[PDB]
Every structure is written in structure tokens, then in C-alpha cells.
Amino acid sequence: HFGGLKDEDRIFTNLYGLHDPFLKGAMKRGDWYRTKDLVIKGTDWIVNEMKKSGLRGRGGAGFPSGLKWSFMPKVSDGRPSYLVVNADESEPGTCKDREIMRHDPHKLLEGCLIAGVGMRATAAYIYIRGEYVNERKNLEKARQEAYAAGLLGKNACGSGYDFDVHIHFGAGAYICGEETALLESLEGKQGKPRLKPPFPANAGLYGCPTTVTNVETVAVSPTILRRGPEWFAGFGRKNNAGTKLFCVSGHVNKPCTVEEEMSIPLKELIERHCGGVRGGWDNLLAVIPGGSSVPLLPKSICDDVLMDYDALKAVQSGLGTAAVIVMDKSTDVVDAIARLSYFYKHESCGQCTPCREGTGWLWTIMERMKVGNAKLEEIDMLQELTKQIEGHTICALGDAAAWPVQGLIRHFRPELERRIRENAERELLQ
Amino acid sequence: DNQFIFKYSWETLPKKWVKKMERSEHGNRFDTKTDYLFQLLCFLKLHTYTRVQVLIDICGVDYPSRKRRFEVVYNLLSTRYNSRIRVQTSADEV
Amino acid sequence: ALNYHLDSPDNNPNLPWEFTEPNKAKVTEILSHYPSNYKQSAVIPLLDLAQQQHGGWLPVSAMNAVANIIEVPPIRVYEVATFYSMFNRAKVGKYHLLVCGTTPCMIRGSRGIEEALLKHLGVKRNEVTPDGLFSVGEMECMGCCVNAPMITVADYSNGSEGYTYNYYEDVTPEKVVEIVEKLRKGEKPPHGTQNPLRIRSGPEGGNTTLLGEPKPPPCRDL
Amino acid sequence: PARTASQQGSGKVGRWKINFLSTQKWENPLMGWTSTGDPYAHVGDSALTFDSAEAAKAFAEKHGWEYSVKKRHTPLLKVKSYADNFKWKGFP
Amino acid sequence: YDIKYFSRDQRRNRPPIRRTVLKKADVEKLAKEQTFAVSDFPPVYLNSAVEEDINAIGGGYQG
Amino acid sequence: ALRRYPTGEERCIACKLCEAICPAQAITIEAEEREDGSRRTTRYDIDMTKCIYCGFCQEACPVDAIVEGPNFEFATETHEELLYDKEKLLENGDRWETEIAENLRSESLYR
Amino acid sequence: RSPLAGARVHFANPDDAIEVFVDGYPVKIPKGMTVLQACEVAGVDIPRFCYHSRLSIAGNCRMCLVEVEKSPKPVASCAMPALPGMKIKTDTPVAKKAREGVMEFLLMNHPLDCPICDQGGECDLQDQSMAFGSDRGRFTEVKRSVVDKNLGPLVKTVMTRCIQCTRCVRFATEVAGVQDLGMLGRGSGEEIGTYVEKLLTSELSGNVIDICPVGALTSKPFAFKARNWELKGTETIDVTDA
Amino acid sequence: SNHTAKWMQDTSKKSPMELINEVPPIKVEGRIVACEGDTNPALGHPIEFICLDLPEPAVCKYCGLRYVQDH
Ligand SMILES: Cc1cc2nc3c(=O)[nH]c(=O)nc-3n(C[C@H](O)[C@H](O)[C@H](O)COP(=O)(O)O)c2cc1C
Ligand code: SF4
Ligand code: SF4
Ligand code: SF4
Ligand code: SF4
Ligand code: SF4
Ligand code: FES
Ligand code: FES
Ligand SMILES: [Zn+2]
């Protein structure tokens, strides 16, 4: 019912980089077509188009982009206000922003200009992760090309809007992907996220009103503006609509990143574009639908689950970055989740107690339960510790660390039961 | 437990001298005035359904903050009806 | 030992450290990229530039120089360089090999690749080779998860110029050994995916999307 | 007695004490212990705790010894905000 | 492995003390409302001697 | 009596849990940092004419340093003799170390 | 309902006085004053480890969590501003469970060295654990350990006991005025101090040990001299300065 | 020295400081240790975990034993 996008309906037409990704390729593919007219149309008009386009945040939160942009102050106060574009993707399984920046950087720049115009932002900062250095060089060259051509600067186009885009790179931190942690790191401090009595739309980058927006949303902004909000709302279903690019990785035959219509069945997504599970559909054990943050799903749910915000939320999971990591019967999901917990323990900033200590405790417990050196009441205690960590931590990385363990306990509990009983029998024998 | 004769007393005892009453599992408590303590104990000892005919003890508590620092407490027992009662008043030095 | 300074005849505050002329020009540009009163925002780029210039690691002298440039107490620069993973504060080899190990790569052979690297080089984790050419370690997910297990090579040979943080994706242990041999010999291997049957971040064999020539969207009347 | 500087708990404040200024402690020649000769060495700090300064004054006036009430110092609450923690500096 | 003290905190989990100041009107209302019946009087804790042999309980052995 | 570790160092850190719990206040302790930075008691005396022989200190010890030894035939002709100190307690522990250790094992089973 | 510690509220103007509900009893509070101080005015104190009245506001310990109505998650009292008609609760099972869990996470890596710790009877971790935390410990695995730091002839440092509340990091930044102490590291193991061997030197450097809740920073001259309960305290003034 | 002479006057037997300095440092392979006092954890002191990143031996602060990392 949903899926099967055509090449004309696909937004990122250079996803694999088979054509020139620079300005000439951008003009040939249809970038910077009527940016002057789009800017002249109006900030309120752009905000209304985003609101009625059904676009939702692609960074994992899923918040409506139009409303998030409308949260900015309308009256220009003394503070200059800022746009920030989250190119710092470090959640395991997702690499969509890497491809976007590497092969369609002019789309990203035009999106930055459009978002800044629509949110009355003086300047934009693109926060690239430190690992992406070739992508950073490509984006630097694209930005220099745009500045030379006059697409950015004092006169972005025939319009009189003042806009300057700068790019700042991190130094390899996963917490820096969070909005407030990214603002703190861009200030030159440690990547420690702030609390949320001051929202970033009120006191953000330098205490000025800033808006943190994902690369995919900001890049698809000009395309949906030029092609009509109705065209974007045609794909998908209900609230969650549009075109989302999924990275299918893991034990699939031919892992790949492909842009597809929202609300496509997960099975149809896997066995049509990617190629399918390594040993057929029956070989599939568990799929993490988003990045490592969201809980996994067993083979039973993945038969009919739909890859979108709502169905994945109708089941106890989330779309997140919509990068599916599959695991067949050959691997051990307990070890996979133990490695995920180790990653979260390593990448927690360690400012707030439930995540600084709880992530390490979860990793140690998962390492113990991988071999089977635990108890039934200890897996119950692991679930209780997950609940304790979840709701009492500064940012959503506590939730991202708690969710995979909770999902593994919910779904693959008999595996842990068998491992613990087998280890108990072996200990008794020894 | 056994809060029977305490409630019966509060039902039958004259209300003139019952300054305050406390219903507790740590012991039912009567606090009265020093003028009517003798009459109150005479009523309890002699009445047929509140026969606290044995005086467990008399204690004193010092409360320097209060105007009447001394608190004189009387622990009484009713063996016929099997329950303990407490009657206390406040007195100063002089 | 990894979060405090132990004095050594190298890497102590007494040694003077300063940028070369091209690095000073780059520092000026980086500072110009940020507001004048908020020059502390450039601490990460300045530390990266110092790390490239000093052979791949950040001495406390360079730390203090960066702090002086951004006009902040040196403890802030110490905190910044300690917090982030990419900033090396101990001596590493001319080539820093980094394996992923995170679950999407671990379920594909990242552990085997790392153990093959350890066996071939003969050293352990975060330990430079006795010759000093190579230093192998792992870190968290570094993008291109969909491109099979991968290794990143940080090339600190030529210094600030010629520095390459190259990717090598879809690698097998034999391919990793071949890349290490080429790097040791001195020839730069072609970075990117190693499978000849696939396009970068694309399905193996032929592509299933964007087969035709891209065309401008029909657009909208504006 | 004011709140301890070592810890922020405020459950030991609001009480009033009579401070018998009894400092006549020496060292025992045999074992080095802290001898004393004043009966009021520790009673004011141990047993005598008053609900309020008025009660303490009433007790002191009743018992006859001269007293001098020390004014207690009270913290002042002011508005604090994490938004003011993140303030914006002016233009360069 | 299920440590949770706010539910078994028997020392502090007690209801607050309730106070009610009854006035003359309330006292008269309760006095008029209340009445005494033969079944509302306090029960008597009655006991008496039995004069039972020492070897009567278990034959003097069971203890 | 006061014990020692098998190495030979004093078992008693200066935590001052002895006189915090001693109901008769028969223990007086003063301490300062040693030469090598270790926390040790520079003065530790117990009145045997004020001790009620209740074992509160020996069960409040976090390191099993003070123990109420099995010896009880230590009647002295002088009160000053009955006023112990750290050196006498340590020599008592050294003398009765084996029996105290056996009793401590047997009772640590019952704990 | 007298304010906590007899504290006196400072109203910038009588017009600005919003009515906020704390545990059912409403109180009048200025506009920008936070939930923690709202409950302080109401008369109830909330456990806190990284909040100081003079210092700034940070959610490092996450233990001052109270349940405000119409809010899915427990909110930090020390950081959330008080809004008009806000129903705050501190004795709910949600708040009690949050406090117990945060205490457990704080104590899961705290070393078992209270008897040698100079903060015996004056340690906020001990008192708050005995007041709000549970009576047991579910942790039996390997703890973490930190090497000690030399911070001068006044501050003896045992960094195993540090709970990383950053109260002293921002004290040196704001009150002392010399920025030498800092939280350096990332994750469960993050150390505090100076990267280089830098003895902290300031006139107010003695206050660093005073604000440390745990016995991480202690007076070196008073290293192991005495406990708290032994000492009798007389309220006097100083004559060294004017 | 001064402290030992302050609490002891025998000055003929070996003080505990000299004995604990004479016992050699304990070489351990790992980066962290568990210091318990003796072979029986229940008969020693509360468990103390010691960090061994510094080159010099680290005193246990309980039954001080100077554990040193192997390499
Ligand atoms: C642990 C964690 C990881 C995050 N990773 C990313 C990321 O890889 N990319 C991103 O754009 N935002 C990331 N974020 C921030 C949120 O996705 C945030 O909502 C986003 O920057 C803005 O939302 P948007 O999707 O509407 O643009 C992360 C946040 C947390 C707490
Ligand atoms: S939940 Fe806490 S510890 Fe985790 S990264 Fe966020 S702020 Fe840091
Ligand atoms: S056994 Fe003796 S020294 Fe120990 S606590 Fe009891 S009375 Fe005090
Ligand atoms: S309780 Fe034990 S360690 Fe503490 S002072 Fe007494 S003997 Fe010493
Ligand atoms: S601060 Fe920690 S180490 Fe010191 S006594 Fe308190 S809980 Fe123990
Ligand atoms: S040393 Fe003390 S005051 Fe400083 S962060 Fe650690 S616990 Fe807080
Ligand atoms: S999981 Fe290895 S690159 Fe992302
Ligand atoms: S005191 Fe509020 S979070 Fe620590
Ligand atoms: Zn020890």
C-alpha cells in the first residue's frame, strides 16, 4: 500500500553520488532554482507551508518541523538568533547525513538558507561530527562555491536577506548530537547538555534564540517548498508522512541506504531494495527499527510492522533515525545489546548521576548475563534499574541507554532464562 | 487496644474537666486541670464500668519551654475490664 | 593516567609550542569564523590543528598555547581535550588505525578484523608499534554503518598538510592487512568502500534506486 | 545555634540554647583527660533546649542568672534562574 | 534484588495526627445524640479458679 | 584489647566509633596523621574501672580492631594499673592474638 | 508554616507574588524563584547534592526530584522555575522512588571508607542516605577507583569519594575567581582537579572543602584529628582581618 | 617518628610503621585491586578498591599494603 517511490518522487537524487555533487551538478539536478522567490515569499508563508506539509523531525524526536520553526520569536530583539544544523550523527546504524553532506551539499546549504529565512535567523552553524572529514571538505568546497556564486552572504539572492553559514566540526562525541550539548560544544565548552527550563528558542547558542534542526529535515525543506506541501503529504499516512531514507544494515544480504515512502512495511523494505535476510525471512531473529536508542522487535512483529513514527510507536518501540539493524539466528542478541550498552556507557557525558553510573552498571550486568552469570531476580533488578535510569536523567541519552535493555528483557527473556539456567547447571557440575 | 472503657468514660464522665483526650495505640490519654484531677480519679476508681482500681504509677516530665514546665502523669489499670488509662495534668514549680 | 599530566622530558609545560606560519593563518581564519567576544568557540578547531601539526597528539604546551590564543584559563582547554575522543593526548604512531566494534559492525566481523590487526602488528590496544609506524585502537560508531566493518586511518606523517582521516569500508581481514602493508611501504591506498561490486553506500551489484538520469522537479505558480 | 557549614541540612536550626560560658577545663596530670569544676559544663548544650528565645528568656529570668540574647542570623532568599546562568554577552 | 524502602518504611509511614476542637455546642449535640443500651456497656474481663490437678494436662509429661 | 593485621600494622584506624557507642564513656581517643599519611591513633586509653564489659565497641569496630579478649583474671592492686592505654591494649592483643583469632573466627561464623 | 531555617523572603515588589501549591498548602513566592526555594518557603527541605544557594544551578546529582502535576517526568527542584498555580509534591511514591534510585546510583561506586573519611556525622551522603535512601545495596561488582590529587597544604583530596557534583568546579569559577579546578573526563570515570600539577592558591581556597558534601576535599591540618560530635562549637568572630 | 614516640614509649620493639614499610609491595596484573585485609574478607576490613595508574605504589588506606601494577 505504501512505498515504491519513483525516481521523480525521490528527493535525494544523488544519494549514491554517481553524478557531480558540486554547484554545476546542483543546478543540473534542480537546486537554487527559485530561492530568491522563496525568500521573498515570506517567513510566515514558509512556516505555514512547513506546518501544512506534515514534515516531522528526522533526527529521532519526530517533532513537527513547522511548529518547531514557528517557536522562534517573531519580533527581532537585540539578540541576533541562530540556526544550527545537526550534522553530528553518531547513533549506531544511521549514516544518512553522511551521504547527504557528501553527495548533496548544495541541497543542505539551500535548506540552511531557507530555514534561516523562515525562522528569522541571522546566521547558521552546521555542526559536522569530527569523524566526517572528507564530507567536511566537500561541504567546505560547496560553501565556497555558493559564496562565490552569491547564493549566500549579504545578498543570498535577488532578495535582500542577510545570511551567513559557517560549519563547525566536533571531536568525536555521541552526546554532542543532542541539541543543548551541541550548543554547549559549539560554545567551546564540554559537550554536556543543558536542562530544559530554558528552551533553545529562548536562550540557545550564546543565550540567543537558536533552533537546532536535523540535516535531513533542513535539506528536504526547499524540495517540499518547491514541489508543494500536498506532494509531500501524499506519501505516507496520517501525521507521519513524506519520504525518509532508511539505512538497512546487519545480517541482510546487501545492506544499503535507500530513500523510500513513509509507512512502508518493514518486511517489504528489507526484501525489495536491500535484498532480504541472509538465510531468508525465517532466518530473521530481531530487528532494531531505528538507531540503537529505540528498543528492538522480534521476528513476529516485523512481519507486519510499518516503518513509520506511529506504528513503531503503536508497538513498544520508535522510529528514531529509521536505520534498521537486522540480526538473524546466527548471532546472539544478548551480546549485541551488551555491546550497545557498552557503547552507551562509553558515550555518556557523565554529568548527571543516573546516567553516569547507571550506564556502567547496565553494561556490567549485560556482560554478566551474556555468559549467564546472573539470576532471575537479577534480570528483574536489571529491568528495575532500567526504569530508574529512564525518567530521572538530564537528557534523552538516559532513555536511549535504558530502552534497548528494556526491549531485550521484554522480548528475549526466555533466552536469558536459558543462559542463566545453563550456567547454573555448569557451575553445579563443576 | 481495648478502647471500651475509655470511650464509655468520655460518654459518661462530666465534660467540665476533660481538657483534652487522645485516642492512640500507644495508650489512651486524658489531660485535665489540676483542680479536678482528684474528682476525676475518684469517678474512675468508683464507677462500676470504668473500675481502674489499681494505680500503676505516677511520673513526671520536665518541659522547660512551657509556662507550666512539669507534667504529672498517672498510669492506671482496670483489671476487671482489662485496659490501661492515662490521666495527666500540668504543674509548675510553686 | 589518561586524565592527568605526568611530567616527561617531552610533553611538559616548560617546552615552548607555537603554530607554524600556515597554521597561524588557519588559526586567524578559524577565529574570524566566530564572534570576537566568543573566541572560545574555536577551541576544538584549534586543538585539532595543533594535533595535526604535532604528529598526532596534543602536548600540554600546545594545550596552553591554544588556551592563550582563545584567552581562557588553560583548565578549560584541558577539559575540552580530555572530554572528546578524537583528541589524542599520548604519543601515537604515524598511522592511527581505528576499528569500530559497535554492534552493527561487530555482527559483521569487526572483532575479527581487530584481532587480525593485533596479530599482524604484534601490539595490543592503544599501544604504538616498537618501530612507531602504527598504533591501533577502537572507538564508537563512526558512520557508514551500512558499509560492512570498516577501519579509519589517521595519517600524521606529513603533518598539518597532507593529513588524511581516511575511511576504508567493506574490509575483510586480508584487505586490512593489505592496507596496513601499503601504508607501511608508503603508498596511499584508495580510501572508501573496498567492494568493487557496489557503489558507495549502495546495494551490492546494480542499484535499485535512481537508475535514470535525475531531472529538475516540475516545481510550483509561485 | 547556626547551621553547620559542613552540610546543608536545616533540621537542627531554630532551636535556642543557654550558653553557660564555662571554660575552666584543664589536663589531668595522671592520664591527660579534660577535667572540669563547673557543674554547668555541658547541661546547657545537652539537656536544656528551648522552643524559642522568649522561652529561653523566661527561663533565665525565672532562675535569676543574668542573660544576654544573641541575635540569630537568617539566610535571605533571592531569585535564581538557570536561564540567567546562560546569559548572552554583548556585541564585540 | 528488589530493594524498595518507601513501601516497608514502617517507622515513617504513619498517618498524621488529627486534632479537633469540640466546643459547647458540639458537646451538647453529642450528649443529646448518644444513648446507653445493655449491649453497649464495656465487656468484663472475667476469670476464675478451676482447682485442677497437676497431672491433668497431658498426664504431667507433655510440657 | 587491641589487635593487629597479619603484616604487623595496627588494625585500628582512628574512626572513633569506640567512644561514640561506649555507653559508659570509658574510651578516650585522640589521633593525627602518621608520617606516611596513614590514619592512626596517637592516644587510645580505656578505663577498666569504667568499662561495663558490654562489647559495644568490639561489635561497632569496622575493622575488628578492638576485641574484648577471653582473659578475665587481670585483677590489679591499683586503680592506676586498672587505667589502661594504647600500649597496654596492643600488648594484650599481641599476647592473646591466637585465642582471640580463634574466637573471632568462630563468632564471625555466627554473624 | 514558617519558612525553612527561618528564612526571610526578599520580594522585589509586592505586586509580583504568585501563589504556588506545595504539598497541598499554597504559599506566595516571587516570579523567578525556583521550585526548590518554593518548597523551602513552604517549610519542607529537599535533598540536594549539587545545589548551593550562593553558587549557580546545575542538575548534576538529579536527586532533588519532586512530582509537579501535569508533568510526565520528575522535575529538578533546584532548576525548574515556579509557575503560578503549580501543584508540587515531595512525599509521593514517585518522588520517593526517584530519591532512592538516585541514592543507590550515587552509592554504587562510593568507596566503603567512611570510618577513615573525615566526614563522619557531617557527610551529606550519609545523612541523606539514612533519611531518603534505601537500607540495602544491590551492587556487588567491581567499584571504581581514583588516584589522589595534591592540591596544596590545606586541601587533602580523596577523589574516590567525589560524587562529581561540580560544586567546587563552579565555586572556583564564580566565587574564588581563579579557574584551576575542573571536571575533566567523560563517562562513569571522570576526574576533577588540574591537568598539570597545580596547587590551588587563593584567599577563599579554604571554602572548597566546606562545600564538598562528601569527604572528597578535607582540611589537611585537621586531617584525622577529631570527629564532629566530639567538638563543641562556639559562635565567635575573627580578629585576623577587619 | 614523632607520632610513634607519642603513642609508644617502649622504643625497643619494632613499631607497626617499620613492619608495614618492611612488607614488600604486592604486584598485581590488573589496573584495579580489591583490598580486604587478609585471606578471609569477613575478618578483615571494608573492601577498598585502589587505582594503580600512578607509577608509585598505592597505599590501601586500610591495612596499607602498597599494591603495584605489573606492567
Ligand atoms: C543521545 C542523543 C543522540 C542524538 N543524536 C542525534 C543525531 O545523530 N542527529 C541529530 O540530528 N540529532 C540528534 N540528537 C538530537 C535530537 O535528535 C534533536 O531532536 C534534534 O537535534 C532536533 O530535532 P529535529 O529532528 O526536529 O531536527 C540526539 C539526541 C540525543 C539525546
Ligand atoms: S542522560 Fe545525563 S549522563 Fe546521559 S549523556 Fe545525558 S546528561 Fe549526560
Ligand atoms: S565493652 Fe567496655 S569499652 Fe567497649 S563499649 Fe562496652 S563499656 Fe565501652
Ligand atoms: S571502632 Fe575499631 S577502628 Fe574504630 S577507633 Fe575503635 S578500635 Fe579503632
Ligand atoms: S562522605 Fe561517603 S565516604 Fe564519607 S562517611 Fe559519608 S557516605 Fe561515607
Ligand atoms: S570534589 Fe566534592 S564538591 Fe567537588 S565535585 Fe566532587 S563531590 Fe562535588
Ligand atoms: S556501527 Fe560501525 S560504523 Fe556505525
Ligand atoms: S540539587 Fe538539584 S539536581 Fe542536584
Ligand atoms: Zn587494606
Author numbering:
A (entry chain V1): 59 to 488
B (entry chain S3): 2 to 95
C (entry chain V2): 27 to 248
D (entry chain S4): 50 to 141
E (entry chain A7): 65 to 127
F (entry chain S8): 112 to 222
G (entry chain S1): 58 to 299
H (entry chain S6): 31 to 101
Paste lines from the article.
The last steps of respiration are carried out by oxidative phosphorylation (OXPHOS) in the inner mitochondrial membrane (IMM). In its canonical form, OXPHOS involves four multi-subunit protein complexes of the electron transport chain (complexes I–IV, CI–CIV) as well as the mitochondrial ATP synthase (complex V). Complexes I–IV transfer electrons from NADH or succinate to molecular oxygen through the electron carriers quinone and cytochrome c and establish an electrochemical proton gradient across the IMM. OXPHOS complexes can exist independently, but more frequently assemble into stoichiometric higher-order assemblies called supercomplexes, whose functions have remained unclear.
Our cryoEM image processing resulted in two initial reconstructions of SC I + III2 containing the full complement of subunits (‘bridged’ SC I + III2) at 3.3 Å and 3.6 Å resolution (class 1 and class 2, respectively). Further improvement to the CIII2 map quality was achieved by subsequent focused refinement around the MPP domains. These focused refined maps were combined into a composite map with nominal resolution of 3.2–3.6 Å. The mung bean SC I + III2 map showed three interfaces between CI and CIII2: (1) a matrix site formed between NDUB9 (CI), MPP-β (CIII2) and MPP-α (CIII2), (2) an IMS site formed between NDUP9 (CI), NDUA11 (CI) and QCR6 (CIII2) and (3) a membrane site between NDUA11 (CI) and QCR8 (CIII2).
